Amino acid sequence: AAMATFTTEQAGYQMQAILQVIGYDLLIVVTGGTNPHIGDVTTLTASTVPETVKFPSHDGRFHKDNFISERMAKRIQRYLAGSCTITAGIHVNQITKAQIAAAAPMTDDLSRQIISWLQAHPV
């Protein structure tokens, strides 16, 4: 199983997804960088359009939005047996353009591990 942890690291920083199964429903906590937080929450089922809450900036200043919980939700949506809630909060102090670019492949890498896990542990 009811809990699993997935990690990836590209361009020198790590992202992590912690998955918890509750009933037929999923909770996925996505964090990364030096300052993990909860900046976005995406909710969905297999058959509804995902929706995303965006909290005010965890440190007040402006950071580019990489759409991480939305991107993960799109990848895993068709594998869901019930509801799904994805939090995301990645922060790298003085992030570089290459590290920004790595956010999308790293999210897909976590998504692929999650999908494999769900297929191995049907709920």
Other Cβ atoms within 10 Å of 48 Cβ, number: 11
- Stretch in the footprint of a second copy (CB under 8 A) among 53-61, 70-78, 94-102, 107-115: 53-61
Question: Residue 13 in contact with residue 92, Cβ under 8 Å?
Answer: yes
Contacted entry of Na ion, a second copy, none for residue 123, CB cut-off 5 to 8 Å set by kind: none
- Least distance (Å) from a second copy to the CB of residue 100? 20
Report the residue number, 56 or 97, with the smaller CB distance to a second copy. 56
Contacted entry of a second copy, Na ion, none for residue 34, CB cut-off 5 to 8 Å set by kind: none
Q: Please tell me whether residue 32 binds Na ion under the rule CB under 5 A.
A: no
Residues 6+ apart with CB under 8 A from 40: 52, 53, 54, 55, 65, 68, 69, 70, 87, 88, 89
